[PDB]
Design an enzyme around this catalytic site. Structure first.
Site, PDB file in Angstrom:
ATOM      1  N   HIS A  46       0.796  -1.215   0.000  1.00  0.00           N
ATOM      2  CA  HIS A  46       0.000   0.000   0.000  1.00  0.00           C
ATOM      3  C   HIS A  46       0.810   1.236   0.000  1.00  0.00           C
ATOM      4  CE1 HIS A  46      -2.873  -2.983   0.794  1.00  0.00           C
ATOM      5  NE2 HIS A  46      -2.565  -3.160   2.065  1.00  0.00           N
ATOM      6  N   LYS A  59       4.062   5.758   7.982  1.00  0.00           N
ATOM      7  CA  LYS A  59       3.687   4.655   8.879  1.00  0.00           C
ATOM      8  C   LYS A  59       4.825   4.294   9.819  1.00  0.00           C
ATOM      9  CE  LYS A  59       0.878   3.061   5.099  1.00  0.00           C
ATOM     10  NZ  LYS A  59       0.866   2.195   3.804  1.00  0.00           N
ATOM     11  N   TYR A 107       0.373   0.171  13.933  1.00  0.00           N
ATOM     12  CA  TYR A 107       0.977   1.211  13.170  1.00  0.00           C
ATOM     13  C   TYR A 107       0.356   2.563  13.299  1.00  0.00           C
ATOM     14  CZ  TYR A 107      -1.953  -0.040   9.051  1.00  0.00           C
ATOM     15  OH  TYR A 107      -2.979  -0.390   8.231  1.00  0.00           O
ATOM     16  N   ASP A 153      -6.171  -7.045  -2.279  1.00  0.00           N
ATOM     17  CA  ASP A 153      -4.712  -7.210  -2.382  1.00  0.00           C
ATOM     18  C   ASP A 153      -4.411  -8.292  -3.386  1.00  0.00           C
ATOM     19  OD1 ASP A 153      -4.302  -5.253  -0.477  1.00  0.00           O
ATOM     20  OD2 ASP A 153      -3.528  -6.623   1.041  1.00  0.00           O
TER      21      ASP A 153
END
Lengths: 200, 200
Positions: free
Chosen positions: A62, A72, A132, A171
């Site tokens: 991503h 992140k 995260y 995904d």
């Protein structure tokens, strides 16, 4: 807190100082002073996400469009995951290259992925929990995926004994790196570097 | 994300929306929009800490002097802990009262503890991991402890089968609530309410 720049510039592996005592252990996952030291600016935490994954789950790859993209700060708090960052910034000297960090509940490392980079991971154990911190909230309209097994990027995922990865439907249908590049959706090195400079 | 104000005003129990799928589960621990909704301002994350505790460990009761004090957004990501918040804000209508939230890896709740409140927890299981976002970095010069078993506060800790709690040396020697009060170190309701208003 030891911070080592990865082979992809603007991504870092952070190793905490773990304080162990009779009660268990404690560490500072993030500190503003520690973060600023390596990143040159403060992390603006706008969202924090948590996943639990079974062995062989692969989430990624991503990224978020600039600006503001989505930096992140990623750790594993139970289990282990093999985490990958990809330089998808067009014009970058290391465009197309990737590197990895082993996140787990033993050394308790973190990966920091700055803006305009692509990120993902493969869970190596069952009940692998990833947390995260993100510099932007979830914005499905500016978030994109690149096939994690894209042959141009050619990431070496460490398959689990010794089976195909499990992916989400989205995904699993992600477009190729070359599809994304040709769609003009990849971030530009010049602008990501400039955007990070305006924060610094 | 369901947010319920506790019996101590300015502390909240947050219950996430947990998305379960073939890979495991995901949830948003914090979002800026979700946080702002209940707190009326954005959480300025300056530090994030993590502890792992064995059964019967009690950490607390901590607070930070205003300003800026240290708001905490606290969750358990493995195991379970019984988390307590104490209204130590002099002049508050509920001065001296406390309430609790069960944090664990089943319902994955959070407790938000706003500025000038005191906080602690008792680990109910081994390998109980707590993460917490803080609005200020660790400042041992403005951080104070109150005896977790103080008889004026009279918190009901749920002892583990069925033994005395394990505390750090500093927490085991913490002064009484009345010592702290008489030292003029407790936060004032009027100023904590005003400080939170200037952020809002």
């Amino acid at each position: 807190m030891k911070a080592r720049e990865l082979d992809v510039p603007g991504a870092w592996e952070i190793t905490p100082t773990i304080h162990v005592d009779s009660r268990g252990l404690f560490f500072e996952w993030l500190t503003d002073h520690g973060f600023r030291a390596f990143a040159g600016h403060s992390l603006d935490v706008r969202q924090v996400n948590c996943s639990v994954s079974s062995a062989g789950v692969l989430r990624g790859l991503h990224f978020a469009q600039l600006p503001p993209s989505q930096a992140k700060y990623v750790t594993c708090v139970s289990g282990s995951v093999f985490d990958v960052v990809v330089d998808i910034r067009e014009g970058s000297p290391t465009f197309g290259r990737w590197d990895s960090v082993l996140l787990d509940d033993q050394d308790r490392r973190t990966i920091y992925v700055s803006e305009g980079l692509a990120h993902g991971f493969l869970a190596l154990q069952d009940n692998s929990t990833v947390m995260y911190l993100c510099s932007a909230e979830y914005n499905p309209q500016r978030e994109h995926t690149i096939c994690a097994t894209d042959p141009t990027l050619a990431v070496d995922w460490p398959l689990v004994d010794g089976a195909a990865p499990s992916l989400s439907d989205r995904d699993a249908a992600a477009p190729s790196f070359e599809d994304v590049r040709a769609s003009g959706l990849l971030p530009r090195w010049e602008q990501t570097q400039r955007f990070i400079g305006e924060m610094r």
